[PDB]
Amino acid sequence: GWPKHTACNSGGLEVVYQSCDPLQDFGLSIDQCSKQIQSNLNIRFGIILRQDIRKLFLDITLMAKGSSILNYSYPLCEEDQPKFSFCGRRKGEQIYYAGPVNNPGLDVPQGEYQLLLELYNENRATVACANATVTSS
Numbered sequence: 001g002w003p004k005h006t007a008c009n010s011g012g013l014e015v016v017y018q019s020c021d022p023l024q025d026f027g028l029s030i031d032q033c034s035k036q037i038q039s040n041l042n043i044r045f046g047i048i049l050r051q052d053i054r055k056l057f058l059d060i061t062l063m064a065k066g067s068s069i070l071n072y073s074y075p076l077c078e079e080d081q082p083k084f085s086f087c088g089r090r091k092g093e094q095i096y097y098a099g100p101v102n103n104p105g106l107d108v109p110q111g112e113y114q115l116l117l118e119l120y121n122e123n124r125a126t127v128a129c130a131n132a133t134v135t136s137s
């Protein structure tokens with residue numbers, strides 16, 4: 001039960017996450033958080049890979065007040081597509097990524113949201129898992 005970590009807390013937006021991979025914790029921080037999220041947020045993401053990656057996928061589950069808002073699923077890479085990606089990385093490699101994610105800008109309405117982020121490979125193996133709480137105030 002990995003401890004809660006603040007990914008960011010500024011400008012009326014707080015994002016706290018907990019790793020849900022039983023093997024390990026990881027580092028995630030978000031630059032320039034605010035209630036008005038800019039398009040293409042910059043993040044810093046640090047993890048030791050516990051699976052090999054030929055293809056990588058990201059699923060996001062967004063909920064609020066016990067109800068589903070949205071489900072999202074997107075392929076991040078296949079080996080060398082794009083070339084600058086985690087694909088081709090292997091078990092035991094320690095990765096640090098500092099760069100944008102390709103989100104739309106969003107003015108987050110005041111309230112609390114629950115987010116589940118699941119990163120997995122071509123074999124449906126969990127590479128990273130985080131459940132998060134987002135508070136817009």
Ligand SMILES: CCCCCCCC/C=C/CCCCCCCC(=O)O[C@@H](COC(=O)CCCCCCCCCCCCCCCCC)COP(=O)([O-])OCC[N+](C)(C)C
Nearest residue numbers: 015045072101102103104108113117118119128129130134
């Ligand atoms: C009704 C009220 C709605 C309010 C909702 C409130 C929600 C606010 C949440 C804000 C906090 C977000 C914190 C989570 C950070 C994740 C970034 C993100 O949002 O992820 C974003 C973007 O994801 C990406 O595709 C980024 C990948 C870029 C490719 C190369 C960079 C590699 C990045 C490495 C990825 C590592 C991921 C790290 C997380 C691992 C955890 C296991 C998901 O976007 P979304 O669902 O609209 O697709 C976007 C819609 N389009 C697809 C049309 C644009």
Ligand SMILES: *[C@@H]1O[C@H](CO)[C@@H](O)[C@H](O)[C@H]1NC(C)=O
Nearest residue numbers: 004016017018114131132133
């Ligand atoms: C993650 O989920 C667990 C169990 O559902 C919950 O106790 C915890 O508060 C969640 N963590 C965050 C940061 O939302």
Ligand SMILES: *[C@@H]1O[C@H](CO)[C@@H](O)[C@H](O)[C@H]1NC(C)=O
Nearest residue numbers: 061062067068069070071072
């Ligand atoms: C998201 O998927 C869950 C099941 O995983 C489902 O209960 C929910 O209705 C889905 N939400 C939407 C908006 O399609």
